[PDB]
Design a protein around this ligand. Structure first.
Ligand SMILES: O=C(COP(=O)(O)O)[C@H](O)[C@H](O)COP(=O)(O)O
Ligand SMILES: O=C(COP(=O)(O)O)[C@H](O)[C@H](O)COP(=O)(O)O
Ligand SMILES: O=C(COP(=O)(O)O)[C@H](O)[C@H](O)COP(=O)(O)O
Ligand SMILES: O=C(COP(=O)(O)O)[C@H](O)[C@H](O)COP(=O)(O)O
Ligand SMILES: O=C(COP(=O)(O)O)[C@H](O)[C@H](O)COP(=O)(O)O
Ligand SMILES: O=C(COP(=O)(O)O)[C@H](O)[C@H](O)COP(=O)(O)O
Ligand SMILES: [Cl-]
Ligand SMILES: [Cl-]
Ligand SMILES: [K+]
Ligand SMILES: [K+]
Ligand SMILES: [K+]
Ligand SMILES: [K+]
Ligand SMILES: [K+]
Ligand SMILES: [K+]
Lengths: 322, 322, 322, 322, 322, 322
């Protein structure tokens, strides 16, 4: 297949984390499919279809843990598959792909804005909020509550090894929100003064577990310990359909040099191994609510989001497979 | 008073953490008093006594949290005080100081070796041990168990912000112990595969609480969560006499530029504050045993170590005060 | 608008708690809209519509915490509103108000009887049951169990500050049920002998939390500590629609002189503040089941009752608004 | 009245536990109805209908606790009853009974197979799995994970008093799976080395509680203590519809001589009573997932399985009742 | 036999709770013995000895639960008994009684002062403290922290049925301390805002359990739930020696008319029983420290206080017994 | 050495468990050293010393887990050793062996009686008590309570694999105590009706952990879940000195054919391994008190019993070593 440059570059940027965060990765995948479709020099429906399948596979094979990425490719490719198999001609097939992409992208933006509005109602004047990593859905909540006049402060954890917390601290301070920045290890120490914990998600499973940046689960555990509300801000496309049929979520292991720079690491002895898991699993007993664009649910209702939105597709193969 | 150079330099090195770890800080303080005494050009007992009081105050005012430092100065200064007040002449007073210092220093070395031997009996062939920071008492335990032929591995957490875990990983690997190095945030994720947790202490309180490097308490919490043994390796001079009469232990707050380098931090906006607590408090319910040079105790027997060894001195003022 | 006397009187009696209990308040509110529609001297539909709107606002601004009140008002006014906007003449609009209110009242009564039949199946012969406040729904359960010939005893807590427990003790004893009356403080001490706890609700939230009379959450906490089943008897109109989209339930703060009578309180020093929250929040982890007129549910299924009964109205404004 | 000997023999064998296991019991009851219908010498539909009702009652009165049995009888009898009341003639009613019986049996076999395929995806290479009693649904899970090439080992508890664990041990070993066999008392002692607990169910209630062989609740309690996953493998026909309306599940008390043999027991004095409950109740907080043939659910979604499959029947009497 | 009216009046006042609080009751008993000895018209030592024994018995039979009372009687009577049996003459035995009484009283006053000084060091500036009942030992703590210039605020629970919280509220406010006054039921609701719980004790047992005013156990349970420190301020004479040898502490059941006044209660039907326990048992896992006049201890060191102070007396009968 | 027949026989009977129970084993071991000293035909002290050493080694290499055995051996042999090294002639050494052994036996018997008197004070009229295995110390408690006229019932668990519970059930019933006999698996199911749990010990460690018959820790876990008091009746010679200096208690693994009789086990597949741990470890958090002959202690005071009774011997070698 003739795959445009933009697919390869998007995929590279997803792998190296120049494009990061689960929502954004998903939109970048949709965007990459859109562009494959705009620029295809294919002449028959079958050549575009083959290109879109191949592009989808390229994009799916970047980072495994955030289900947002394949849910975006499915959103597009289910619709493209149905049009192709229904006898669509070339320009019809192209436009199904382009318009599906745009639609996912728009709904993603709108879901995040609505999660903001719903989640902000739970934030109260004077609240100290602790967060972790950098999540646009969680930030949407904190930004909105501040826009409503509530005087909040946010405790931002630095989020080793990639320092996502620096992104969050700078962004929240740019909206005028006072920030306290701490190392991850200090989360129990400051949990007494915290009123709420607001974090994002990469995948949410059928039984209510949340997969999110390495350390989330520790934060949640000590939050529960201290009876501090744990709120997870997550779009419907963070819910993981394959877990309904027993699939385990793969935890991505990333390069040890994100932890210890190559310069330093090559001087270390062989009998030291560096392990660098980028995500951990938080069980539902430590989460009080998930804030989606359709409402607040307990984590044990994740299964209902999945049955409503994604169950239908589980009988079929992935829409990009042969 | 005429204070020798070595007192000022020791104190500076303690403050900047070029001399670090609670045991070592204490020995460096004893050592500094020893040298003030060796080199004093005082002519009367009262001039040396005044110099030793002043030196003690200099040393006490470096870092507040590890009670090892004042317990060492007390060990020396109680003995010096009693000799001075008993009418000691100059050379007698000098030697009381020098010999007391040496004695603390020797007993410290021997206590750590014995903690090693006692703690190693609790480590079993095949054990995966998790640790935090860099503690010579904890390391003594792991080194000894490896010397006994037990095939162990150690999970070393990096210990932000000062990276003490790098010291530990390199030291344990130099003895031939296989090391797995992880960020602090990954401690819950790897707690399932961990058999034992072995950490040090800076201060242990009357009710059994352990004050140790920022993050210890999170590690302990998730250890308890997973029914993983939490063992604290601590010399008797880590027990904190003033807590028997209600004293709270001060948590040292260190410079924000240890978290975010000055180059980067000066570019950040004013409405971000960086908080850098160097220690946290682990309650006794999350500790299974303390390994001292006199045995294994439950954390609730800390009070007995204190009553035996230090209660006597609480009626009196600090031995270096006027 | 020409608001009839029974509306003002009902509103004063809800406010002063001469009419109290969440179900009874809701039925009284529907009865008041009923009497307004009956006696209105309106000539136009637009005039009666406007009277019912104003009556509704009066009734809604009485006590904030029990969502039964607005759910009753909505039940009548969604129906009145749809009639009005579909051109109903005067007598059609009138009958729609009167009939919808009678429907609400009749369904409320049947729901309570059915809650009793369902809940009584979980009560066993010889059971000691502890309750709190005065809940018609909880009493329905206990009364039905006793009529089945189960030999029960009920421990009734006094329920400060308003003494609702006196109502409960005399009601149960007048049905022939043996009663043990205790102070709220004694709930842990007698939890060892209790087999079941049965309490009502004022509001149940999307995440499964139960808002009920101050003290409820303490009793639930210690029931859970002791593995004593906590059952909340509640009608579907106790479920709180706005919590689906993030709203917090307002906790009513009633007058200090309910706690300390005015004649005593005026003599107390100024630096004493009396705080009188009329409700607390029991988290779903301390509740075993909610008994609704449609069946036994776990508390985390509250979101399903809400989705199916109330979710449709949330995109619209309140049916009594301009 | 003219009941074939296969109905009586099936009943005897259920009661004596020659036919045992909840799914197998349900298959054997459907089969017994099948045979009554095939061999009936009835000449009129009302007479066949009577035999099916009497045979249903005889099979229902065998063992109380596993709801699979009545759910099987209902599956056949709801269909038979609708055909009888719809005017079906003899051969039509006969066929309805035979074919409904056959479908239940075939659905049961397929459901156990699908549970295996779904549950096996949760099992990872190198897993130690603990199980209890003998459950074909739990075994299907382990058998499929092993066929996928996962090197698992299974800890099998003996399961007093009837020794069902001997069946499990010999069966898993015949498939190639290594087994560690222990007494029920040792389950906490080996919970440290276990990665997963996989058990079956007799009845699952509307609140998510699982009723299973005596001792299950203990294993789940200590598994929870240790953060070991508890997975319950259970077909939809193990869900108990009467619990939706408050019914308590009856715990079967079996003969004391299963505990102590008759010869020994008759020598014991009369102030010893032997108590032999065959099942216990595990609360939903100690269960991570239930694996049904429709997917993985949190136990709190048991109510959703009940609503969509069984709720409809609750307004009617039992299809075998007069 | 010739008992002075002050003994009888002291006893009446203890029984009616005109003299109340464990420490005050013990002081009043020592004082009553003092007065019997001062005013005795006995002419022989055996006759004074008899009066002291009879008066001890009368004071012992007033209120059972607070061990301070018998410990005060023992303090005086062990000394009196050793003087009588050592041959003391009249004036010698008289003086032994007077002076032992005086020492107990003076030691009690000093002990409460020292508890204040020790406990106040645990209180930090800005602390919200919750308390229960009226305890002079707990109040000494708050009063001293305020005198040190810590801006504290105290949540005082009303303490039904005798309203001891009104004493506490008015007393702390008279010292300048702001008070929030609430019903006992609201303790969980305000536990989120509380930094510390500070209560007293009637008896502390050999296993670390604290027996204190009804409701204490509830407050400690929810404090533990919230990670709020529970501190018990208690003199050494609140430790219960008979528990070392297995004795159960008797929980006083007081008149029902303290709960419901006589006038109302006589109108109630006979199938209502009012139960009025005046104390409950808080287990040691819910207590962080006991603050004695000898220092801070974990509750598990209660046995050490008992061993060193009281153990000696357990082989003897009560010093007032024949 | 000329070892008498009774030593070899006693050692075989400990090994085969014809002599079992930790206290009884200890008394049998002392009785065997006694008989060796009685019948020895030694001529020199050095010869008898050497016989007693060898006899001791034989007796110690029988069963490893109950420290009562070596503590008995030490009791006799510390004394024999000190006599020998202080020049005792033949008859003096002999008498020292015989007398020390008789002293151990007499003190063991008195300790058990006294444990009974102390423990029975914690048992109340109407109590349901659950026990496990067969512990003379626990039986002493129950038997004394029943002789005081407390109307108790005892739930006795069968205690697989060796059925020690049959011994317990018949012993208690022969004293007139009502007995309910159940399988170990049923302990959680009947924990709701139990008021107290009373069990023995084999070894108690420095950190407060109790090593007792397999299953003990499970019963303790669920007692704790249900707030049922767990009391361990144990003599001071059940406390384990070497744990003070870090030693782990060896858990005895007994023969697989205790679980599955040889005639059945030889027919089972090779990939089944039967594991038969005779003991487990109950952590101190699940124990309320230890009842020793010196009084009630919390489990965390085990270290005090050890320090005062046994600590002195730890710097020396075992008194039967070369
Ligand atoms: O764990 C991360 C980022 O992972 P990484 O940095 O590894 O992509 C974020 O919390 C989620 O992705 C959700 O973010 P959002 O709410 O922005 O979707
Ligand atoms: O918390 C630290 C180091 O603090 P820092 O790096 O701030 O000195 C170590 O665990 C203890 O000091 C004990 O170490 P040791 O066992 O070596 O005394
Ligand atoms: O909290 C209360 C009463 O509040 P108040 O007395 O302040 O109105 C009752 O438990 C519920 O309202 C339920 O009662 P019911 O089941 O009767 O609706
Ligand atoms: O409790 C038992 C057997 O009871 P019994 O031995 O008393 O029949 C099994 O775990 C379930 O019945 C599940 O079995 P399956 O998964 O085979 O249905
Ligand atoms: O329980 C009470 C009072 O009981 P009552 O009101 O029944 O006497 C107090 O908390 C303690 O007695 C401590 O008091 P203090 O610290 O004053 O000794
Ligand atoms: O664990 C057992 C017996 O082990 P076994 O039967 O394997 O010897 C008993 O509970 C203790 O030994 C205490 O018994 P006692 O209190 O009688 O010493
Ligand atoms: Cl709310
Ligand atoms: Cl051990
Ligand atoms: K907090
Ligand atoms: K582990
Ligand atoms: K109970
Ligand atoms: K495990
Ligand atoms: K708090
Ligand atoms: K119980």
């Amino acid at each position: 297949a003739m795959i445009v440059k933009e697919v390869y570059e998007t995929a590279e940027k997803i792998k190296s984390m120049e494009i990061r965060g689960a929502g954004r990765i998903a939109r970048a995948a949709a965007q990459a499919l859109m562009i494959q479709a705009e620029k295809s020099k294919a002449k028959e429906p079958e050549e575009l279809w083959n290109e879109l399948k191949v592009a989808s596979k390229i994009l799916y094979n970047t980072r495994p843990t955030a289900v947002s990425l394949p849910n975006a490719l499915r959103y597009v490719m289910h619709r493209v598959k149905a049009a192709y198999l229904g006898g669509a001609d070339l320009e019809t097939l192209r436009f199904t792909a382009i318009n599906s992409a745009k639609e996912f992208i728009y709904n993603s933006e709108k879901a995040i804005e609505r999660i903001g509005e719903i989640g902000a109602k739970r934030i109260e004047d004077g609240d100290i909020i602790m967060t972790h990593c950098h999540s646009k859905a969680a930030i949407s909540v904190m930004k909105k509550a501040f826009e409503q006049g509530k005087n909040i402060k946010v405790i931002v954890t630095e989020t080793r090894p990639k320092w996502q917390g620096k992104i969050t601290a700078k962004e929240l301070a740019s909206y005028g929100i006072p920030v306290i920045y701490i190392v991850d290890s200090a989360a129990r120490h400051y949990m007494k003064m915290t009123d709420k914990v607001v974090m994002g998600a990469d995948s949410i499973t059928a039984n209510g577990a949340v997969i999110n940046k390495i350390g989330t689960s520790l934060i949640a555990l000590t939050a529960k310990e201290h009876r501090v509300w744990v709120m997870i801000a997550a779009e419907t496309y963070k819910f993981h359909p394959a877990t309904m049929l027993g699939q385990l979520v793969e935890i991505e292991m990333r390069d040890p040099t994100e932890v210890i720079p190559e310069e330093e690491l090559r001087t270390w002895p062989k009998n030291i191994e560096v392990w660098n898991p980028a995500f951990d699993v938080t069980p539902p007993e430590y989460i009080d609510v998930i804030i989606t664009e359709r409402g607040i649910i307990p984590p044990y209702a994740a299964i209902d989001i999945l049955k409503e939105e994604f169950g239908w597709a589980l009988k079929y193969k992935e829409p990009w497979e042969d």
